Design a protein around this motif. Structure first.
Motif, mmCIF file in Angstrom:
data_model
loop_
_atom_site.group_PDB
_atom_site.id
_atom_site.type_symbol
_atom_site.label_atom_id
_atom_site.label_comp_id
_atom_site.label_asym_id
_atom_site.label_seq_id
_atom_site.Cartn_x
_atom_site.Cartn_y
_atom_site.Cartn_z
ATOM 1 N N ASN A 1 0.844 -1.194 0.000
ATOM 2 C CA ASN A 1 0.000 0.000 0.000
ATOM 3 C C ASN A 1 0.878 1.243 0.000
ATOM 4 N N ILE A 2 1.303 1.661 -1.186
ATOM 5 C CA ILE A 2 2.060 2.897 -1.343
ATOM 6 C C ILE A 2 1.073 4.036 -1.544
ATOM 7 N N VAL A 3 1.084 4.994 -0.623
ATOM 8 C CA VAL A 3 0.152 6.114 -0.629
ATOM 9 C C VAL A 3 0.951 7.403 -0.717
ATOM 10 N N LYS A 4 0.630 8.230 -1.704
ATOM 11 C CA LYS A 4 1.218 9.556 -1.816
ATOM 12 C C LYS A 4 0.267 10.528 -1.130
ATOM 13 N N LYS A 5 0.773 11.265 -0.145
ATOM 14 C CA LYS A 5 -0.098 12.045 0.726
ATOM 15 C C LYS A 5 -0.694 13.230 -0.023
ATOM 16 N N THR A 6 -2.019 13.331 0.012
ATOM 17 C CA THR A 6 -2.746 14.369 -0.704
ATOM 18 C C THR A 6 -2.683 15.670 0.086
ATOM 19 N N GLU A 7 -2.203 16.736 -0.553
ATOM 20 C CA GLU A 7 -1.941 17.998 0.126
ATOM 21 C C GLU A 7 -2.517 19.169 -0.655
ATOM 22 N N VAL A 8 -3.017 20.159 0.075
ATOM 23 C CA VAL A 8 -3.403 21.444 -0.498
ATOM 24 C C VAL A 8 -2.212 22.384 -0.363
ATOM 25 N N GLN A 9 -1.824 23.012 -1.470
ATOM 26 C CA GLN A 9 -0.563 23.736 -1.521
ATOM 27 C C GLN A 9 -0.608 25.037 -0.729
ATOM 28 N N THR A 10 0.482 25.305 -0.016
ATOM 29 C CA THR A 10 0.701 26.561 0.686
ATOM 30 C C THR A 10 1.973 27.191 0.140
ATOM 31 N N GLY A 11 1.891 28.457 -0.248
ATOM 32 C CA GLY A 11 3.053 29.134 -0.782
ATOM 33 C C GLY A 11 2.666 30.451 -1.419
ATOM 34 N N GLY A 12 3.622 31.018 -2.154
ATOM 35 C CA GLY A 12 3.362 32.238 -2.883
ATOM 36 C C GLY A 12 2.481 32.009 -4.096
ATOM 37 N N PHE A 13 1.871 33.096 -4.577
ATOM 38 C CA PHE A 13 0.954 32.996 -5.710
ATOM 39 C C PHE A 13 1.685 32.613 -6.990
ATOM 40 N N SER A 14 2.598 33.460 -7.449
ATOM 41 C CA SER A 14 3.178 33.305 -8.772
ATOM 42 C C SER A 14 4.696 33.276 -8.676
ATOM 43 N N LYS A 15 5.332 33.204 -9.839
ATOM 44 C CA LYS A 15 6.773 33.358 -9.926
ATOM 45 C C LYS A 15 7.158 34.797 -9.604
ATOM 46 N N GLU A 16 8.310 34.962 -8.958
ATOM 47 C CA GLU A 16 8.724 36.275 -8.481
ATOM 48 C C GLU A 16 9.340 37.148 -9.566
ATOM 49 N N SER A 17 9.494 36.641 -10.786
ATOM 50 C CA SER A 17 10.078 37.427 -11.861
ATOM 51 C C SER A 17 9.015 38.300 -12.508
ATOM 52 N N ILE A 18 9.296 39.594 -12.609
ATOM 53 C CA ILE A 18 8.430 40.525 -13.321
ATOM 54 C C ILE A 18 8.887 40.551 -14.774
ATOM 55 N N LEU A 19 8.088 40.014 -15.640
ATOM 56 C CA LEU A 19 8.374 39.911 -17.061
ATOM 57 C C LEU A 19 7.764 41.085 -17.819
ATOM 58 N N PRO A 20 8.372 41.501 -18.943
ATOM 59 C CA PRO A 20 7.887 42.696 -19.647
ATOM 60 C C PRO A 20 6.541 42.518 -20.331
ATOM 61 N N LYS A 21 6.057 43.596 -20.943
ATOM 62 C CA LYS A 21 4.728 43.616 -21.539
ATOM 63 C C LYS A 21 4.641 42.689 -22.746
#
Length: 1337
Positions: A1065-1085
């Motif tokens: 019985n190999i079980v991968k633990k189901t998790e709701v993600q906690t962290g920052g919203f997006s990538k921290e790089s500000i990309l141009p227009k």
RNA sequence: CGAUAAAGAUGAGACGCGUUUUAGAGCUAGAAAUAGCAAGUUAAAAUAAGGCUAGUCCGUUAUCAACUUGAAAAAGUGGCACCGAGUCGGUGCUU
DNA sequence: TCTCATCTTTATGCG
DNA sequence: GCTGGAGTACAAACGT
DNA sequence: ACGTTTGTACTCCAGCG
């Protein structure tokens, strides 16, 4: 009612579990399946593993929070400056601050003219032409005396306030002195004017090159001392030089005052400590320290200014103007030389932004180092550039002004420039004259670190009380914030509470009550015998008070000779006594009493019974605060009891330490009958004189019931709260919590029956930047030239041998020889303490050598000859932070005793017993949760036994016994390790019930070097049939009691059947993600809808923004959308990825969120919340895991037969070879005879791929690459097949390599198939299951 | 017993960059396309969307299968035995 | 990259 | 370094 | 029939000191 056992394997990202019976068999049970599927009962085995992502520390969150606070406070500083300037700004230009606010806007969104400062094109062009940089304006406003525009003054002051520099140097910095040589000659002149007996001669010394050098501070001092003829670094001149560079010297032995008087210029306490030193020796040395301060300013300022200071009052602005001018001149020269000599590579250098030329230096993302690396070969392949190369090797070619070297700029330079601007412009606008101190305070208001976030009760990280309710500004912070109480809370909120009374704070370690407690506690242990007494006796309370009053108040450290002589001979007239219960020296002492006696110079005051709370408050003050004025304001209350010099000596006195015993314990809690506190029972107990450790455990005394009532109060904590209280990394805490939950569910599964065995074991479980910093600091400290000999890269340090070459000074140890870099293969890594004794593969233990036989002996710590010869190198490398103190002791152990057979027996036992504290904590938690009831006389009935093992037992049981583990096949090895842990632990406690105190956590009583050596060398020998030859019987017996502890005839097949068992019985633990919203790089227009807006009114197609969001959980929705021009309701089923930004708005109202997304008439009862790692079963056992709302992961485990695993382990030569030549020769013959097992494993991989791992092209490439390399040796083929098992692994897809051929990962951009599949909800063990058929929705 | 050293955990106070949009009228020849040339170093604003408790505060740590009871912390829910083994199957007994 | 504070744990010799 | 997101180039199932 | 969206292959990127 069947007896069983549980085995556990706890790791950072994996927890394995197994349930075994008495016969080492794993049971199987029929578990009911809930849900709407047709399946109702499933047979599952009681063995499995739980897989989860690693727990993360809070350091990244703390750094982000501190950055947010700093940004808020910088914006508030700018707001304060604007508030000061606004009244006159509205008269000068009312829209100026508005124009500065809307600078980040396009022309269509600006409410004013696009030009920020002046509002018209001509004035903006003229301003930018007059002042190309802001530093030109700053230099102009410091130097010129004409009236300037208020806009320019505000811009300069706001640039200084926004970028105010560091606060590392406390005091005042004077930029008028910048010549190192001039003040060094001045210091020598003052020293020769003071010292005439031994004057210092420093003529012909390159002071600027030595003191302002680029290597380390201590090495700079050493290089000055070595040049200095007949001077010592510990001498007065050397102490002054070290004080000038800032390394703290000790002025005690130089002047013979018997106090340290350590002076550090960067600290604010230096002025008062120098005042003390002037009181010690006199005022004739004051000019010497003033010259030292001036020369320190010369050192610390010549590195950053590098300009004349006699022509301007703004040296930093002049330096930046010099940088701009040099950049302009060398840019013109470089353009001319490139256009003249290499006209083809002009567009690449000056126009191509993608390359690392000047266009990439300015317009592109290339840094200074990358631009130098690009342009230096260009200058080398050109014959008109010498000064440019000289500047490039000096890192001064084409410099910018906003560089990375500005981090060493003090705030005093910006403060001086701001003060100069204010002084120049105060006569013209009176408002800066009235608000000069306001702006200077705005620049120089740093919140003290002992006063946290200036909160009002709505923060979890605030320790701060307000004297009045008022808005805190930089100008009323001292009047509103109670700083002393804030610092007291700062120290007290992280100090410990004593364990006996959980609601009580501990005393300082240097308290008078604590030292009285310890001294009387040790004095109860004293016992005496002298002639005429029939028995040993103990000292009465009147006697003990007299002994404290003479011996402990006089001696500082009492010895038995002193108390015997003075008290027994001098007072009690016993000429000869024998003293027992204490060593020759005493441990306890009235240390703070003696320090206070030294300081106060009074003795009755400290002896007094009723003044003791005052001195407790005094030592509390001396322990709490470290800032001088805080300590001052606390002893202003008690100053009138003392003299002012006495109070100053109190002010400079320090105590650093907290005890672990509170006050109410020592003298607050008292017995019901006697009414005496524990300190009083230490003082007088009639005849008995009994002491602390029993007094908290005495049944007759009421101390034990009060202590247990205090512990019961609060009911301890919850399981999660008790887990977070523990020590260690949060990842191992997550592992332990999942372990406890697994144990609870396993107890529930068996029918609420608890096992009388639980066996646990625990795993032992960026860097490269630390490696580079360590090697650079080592070469700076010792003056090594290895980096100048040959510089290397950063990614090259990942290899161990190359790192070990660069870490040492190009040599190998134990011999005085250089060695070379190119000879990689012929050099080997050696361990200082041999691998046979202890296991330590870190750099702290490892050494790279060319010949290991020069260590003196092969299996021992290096010989005493090697110690006596290499000891100077070991000491100089220890002082250079290249070896550790542990490494020093391990190298120098030969002269201090070497290895005793006791020490060798300890290094043999250490692999078997688990002495790690975290494992003891886990065993305590499991023992407390399992064993709960009490019996008669209130004893814990140990119905559940918790055994702790180390991985050496299971690893040796796998290696010796052909139960080999290969980690790359599947995650079944976690559960197999747990099962083997259970088997080994129960077998060990069945055979040896005498090693329970070593292997089991509990309250037991069962317990020379050579017998220990053979015992802990041979503890597992009862498992094997032949020893060494000794023929032990096939059926082992416990001995002195008859049970079957091991049966070699049938148990072996049981273990092999459990290891060869497909369903785990190999079980991968189901998790709701906690962290920052997006990538921290500000990309141009760009015109994309995947861009996230940085504010509400910043359209990403016009302003740029964030791109890649992180999905918290995926939501399954069945709804109807608009299709076509007619907007027809078309039924659809879909997964929508709810991101962390969208999660609060989704959970507030899912229907509104889905209607905003476009889905109509959605069903609230049909919304299924699917977090990451959710499990779906489609067909033929093809199980998929959810990575996001667009990507799936592979979850399936290849149950490869154990014969293939054993063949792969033996063929690949795991951990090289460690065995007898007959055994490894037989293993190599076995590997040779079964080469068709490679083809069978390839068939297994191909069939398992064609069934569940749908990657056709990757499998065809795998088969082609396998057919290419069939003539390779079997070891290389086996290793590459172990690499090939990455294709079939459970988890996220990844790329692997077959020899030279690489295979990129097969990924998915679709999750459509799982929408008509069986969704599986799995419990933590995975035994209890719920299947939802999503096709019925 | 204190001590020394190292590592880890937690919290606060600060710097220096980096990114993004805007400002820093680019010139000449061409119908444009484009070519040639000039220039480049700086500043403002944002630096998790944001929230209410409106603080010079808080917002990226830890906890988290399903169902039921829930204000939550959490609590409760799922026969057994035997013969076998490719992800678990079959047989018997019983509720 | 720097400053400061608290706690725990492990390795290093005394007794 | 990991692994999920995003862009591009393109062929293929698939609905109007 | 023709569009079209979807399934597949491949490439590149990720705030730091």
């Amino acid at each position: 009612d069947k007896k069983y056992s549980i085995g556990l394997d706890i790791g950072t990202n994996s927890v394995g579990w197994a349930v075994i019976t008495d016969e080492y068999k794993v049971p199987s049970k029929k578990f009911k399946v809930l849900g709407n599927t047709d399946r109702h009962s499933i047979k599952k085995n009681l063995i499995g593993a739980l897989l989860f992502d690693s727990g993360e520390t809070a350091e990244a969150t703390r750094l982000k929070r501190t950055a947010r606070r700093r940004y808020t406070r910088r914006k508030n500083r700018i707001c304060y400056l604007q508030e000061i300037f606004s009244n006159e700004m509205a008269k000068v230009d009312d829209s100026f601050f508005h124009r500065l606010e809307e600078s980040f806007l396009v022309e269509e969104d600006k409410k004013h003219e696009r030009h920020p400062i002046f509002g018209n094109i001509v004035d903006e062009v003229a301003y930018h032409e007059k002042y190309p940089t802001i530093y030109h304006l700053r230099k102009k406003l410091v130097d010129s005396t004409d009236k300037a525009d208020l806009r320019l003054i505000y811009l300069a002051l706001a640039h200084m306030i926004k970028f105010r520099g560091h606060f590392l140097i406390e005091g005042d910095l004077n930029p008028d002195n910048s010549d190192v040589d001039k003040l060094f000659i001045q210091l020598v002149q003052t020293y020769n004017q003071l010292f005439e007996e031994n004057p210092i001669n420093a003529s012909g010394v390159d002071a600027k090159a030595i003191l302002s050098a680029r290597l380390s501070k201590s090495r700079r001092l050493e290089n000055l001392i070595a040049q200095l003829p007949g001077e010592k670094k510990n001498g007065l001149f050397g102490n002054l030089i070290a004080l000038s560079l800032g390394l703290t010297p000790n002025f005690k032995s130089n002047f013979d005052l018997a106090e340290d008087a350590k002076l550090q210029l960067s600290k604010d306490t230096y002025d008062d400590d120098l005042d003390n030193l002037l009181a010690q020796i006199g005022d004739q040395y004051a000019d010497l320290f003033l010259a030292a301060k001036n020369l320190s300013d010369a050192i610390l300022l010549s590195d950053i200014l590098r300009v004349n200071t006699e022509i301007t009052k703004a040296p930093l602005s002049a330096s930046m103007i010099k940088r701009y001018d040099e950049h302009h001149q060398d840019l013109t020269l470089l353009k001319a030389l490139v256009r003249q000599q290499l006209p083809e590579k002009y567009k690449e250098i000056f126009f191509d932004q993608s390359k690392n030329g000047y266009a990439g230096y300015i317009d592109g993302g290339a840094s200074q180092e990358e631009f130098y690396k690009f342009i230096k070969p260009i200058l080398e392949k050109m014959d008109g550039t010498e000064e440019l190369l000289v500047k490039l090797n000096r890192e001064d070619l084409l410099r910018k002004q906003r560089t990375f070297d500005n981090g060493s700029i003090p705030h005093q330079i910006h403060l001086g420039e701001l003060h100069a601007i204010l002084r120049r412009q105060e006569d013209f606008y009176p408002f800066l004259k009235d608000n000069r101190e306001k702006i200077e305070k705005i620049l120089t208001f740093r919140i003290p670190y002992y006063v946290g976030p200036l909160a009002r009760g709505n923060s979890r990280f605030a320790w701060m009380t307000r004297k009045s309710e008022e808005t805190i500004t930089p100008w009323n912070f001292e009047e509103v914030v109670d700083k002393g109480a804030s610092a007291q809370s700062f120290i007290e909120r992280m100090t410990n509470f004593d364990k006996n009374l959980p609601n009580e704070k501990v005393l300082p370690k240097h308290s008078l009550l604590y030292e009285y407690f310890t001294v009387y506690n040790e004095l109860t242990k004293v016992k005496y015998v002298t002639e005429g007494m029939r028995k040993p006796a103990f000292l009465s309370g009147e006697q003990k008070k007299a002994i404290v009053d003479l011996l402990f108040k006089t001696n500082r450290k009492v010895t038995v000779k002193q108390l015997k002589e003075d008290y027994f001979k001098k007072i009690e007239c016993f000429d000869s006594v024998e003293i027992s219960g204490v060593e020759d020296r005493f441990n306890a002492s009235l240390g703070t009493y003696h320090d206070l006696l030294k300081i106060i110079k009074d003795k009755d005051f400290l002896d007094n019974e009723e003044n003791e709370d005052i001195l407790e408050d005094i030592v509390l003050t001396l322990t709490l605060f470290e800032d001088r004025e805080m300590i001052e304001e606390r002893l202003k209350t008690y100053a009138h009891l003392f003299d002012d010099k006495v109070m100053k000596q109190l002010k400079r006195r320090r105590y650093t330490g907290w005890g672990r015993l509170s006050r109410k314990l020592i003298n607050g809690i008292r017995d019901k009958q006697s009414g005496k506190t524990i300190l009083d029972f230490l003082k007088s107990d009639g005849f008995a004189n009994r002491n602390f450790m029993q007094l908290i455990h005495d049944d007759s005394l009421t101390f034990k019931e009060d202590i247990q009532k205090a512990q019961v109060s609060g009911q301890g904590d919850s399981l999660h709260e008790h887990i977070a209280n523990l020590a260690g990394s949060p990842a191992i805490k997550k592992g332990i919590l999942q372990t406890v939950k697994v144990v609870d569910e396993l107890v529930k599964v068996m029918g609420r029956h608890k096992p009388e065995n639980i066996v646990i074991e625990m795993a032992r479980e960026k860097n490269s930047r630390e490696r580079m910093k360590r090697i650079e600091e080592g070469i700076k400290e010792l003056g090594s030239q290895i980096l100048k000999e040959h510089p290397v890269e950063n990614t090259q340090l990942q290899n161990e041998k190359l790192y070990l070459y660069y870490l040492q000074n190009g040599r190998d140890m134990y011999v005085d020889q250089e060695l070379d870099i190119n000879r990689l293969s012929d050099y080997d890594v050696d361990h200082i303490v041999p691998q046979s004794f202890l296991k330590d593969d870190s750099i702290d233990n490892k050494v790279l050598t060319r010949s290991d036989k020069n260590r003196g002996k092969s299996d021992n710590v290096p010989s005493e000859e090697v110690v006596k010869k290499m000891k100077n190198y070991w000491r100089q490398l220890l002082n250079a932070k290249l070896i550790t103190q542990r490494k020093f002791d391990n190298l120098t152990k030969a002269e201090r005793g070497g290895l005793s057979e006791l020490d060798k027996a300890g290094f043999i036992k250490r692999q078997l017993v688990e002495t790690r504290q975290i494992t003891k904590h886990v065993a305590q938690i499991l023992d407390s949760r399992m064993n709960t009831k009490y019996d008669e006389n209130d004893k814990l009935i140990r119905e559940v036994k918790v055994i702790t093992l180390k991985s050496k037992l299971v690893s040796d049981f796998r290696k010796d016994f052909q139960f080999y583990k290969v980690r790359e096949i599947n995650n079944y090895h976690h559960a197999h390790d747990a099962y083997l842990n259970a088997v080994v632990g129960t077998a060990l406690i069945k055979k040896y019930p005498k090693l329970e105190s070593e292997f089991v956590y509990g309250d037991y009583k069962v317990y020379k070097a050579t017998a220990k050596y053979f015992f802990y060398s041979n503890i597992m020998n009862f498992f094997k049939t032949e020893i060494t030859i000794r023929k032990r019987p096939l059926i082992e017996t416990n001995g002195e009691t008859g049970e079957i502890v091991w049966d070699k005839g049938r148990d072996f097949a049981t273990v092999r059947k459990v290891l060869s068992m497909p369903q785990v019985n190999i079980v991968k633990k189901t998790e709701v993600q906690t962290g920052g919203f997006s990538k921290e790089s500000i990309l141009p227009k760009r015109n994309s809808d995947k861009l996230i807006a940085r504010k509400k009114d910043w359209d990403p197609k016009k302003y740029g923004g964030f791109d890649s969001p992180t999905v918290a959980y995926s939501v399954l929705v069945v709804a109807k959308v608009e299709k076509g021009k007619s907007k027809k309701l078309k039924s659809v089923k879909e997964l929508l990825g709810i991101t962390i930004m969208e999660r609060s708005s989704f959970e507030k109202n899912p229907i509104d969120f889905l209607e905003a997304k476009g889905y109509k008439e959605v069903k609230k009862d049909l919304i299924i919340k699917l977090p990451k790692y959710s499990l779906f079963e489609l067909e033929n056992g093809r199980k998929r895991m959810l990575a996001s709302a667009g990507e799936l992961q592979k979850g399936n485990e290849l149950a490869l037969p154990s014969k293939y695993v054993n063949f792969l382990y033996l063929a690949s030569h795991y951990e090289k070879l460690k065995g007898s030549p007959e055994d490894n020769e037989q293993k190599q013959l076995f590997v040779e005879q079964h080469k068709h097992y490679l083809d069978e494993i390839i068939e297994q991989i191909s069939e398992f791929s064609k069934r569940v791992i749908l990657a056709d092209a990757n499998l065809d490439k795998v088969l082609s690459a396998y057919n290419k390399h069939r003539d390779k040796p079997i070891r290389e083929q086996a290793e590459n097949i172990i690499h090939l098992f990455t294709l079939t692994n459970l988890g996220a897809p990844a790329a692997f390599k077959y020899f030279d051929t690489t295979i990129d990962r097969k990924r998915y951009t679709s999750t459509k198939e799982v929408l008509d599949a069986t969704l599986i909800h799995q419990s933590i063990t995975g035994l209890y299951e719920t299947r939802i058929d999503l096709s019925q929705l």
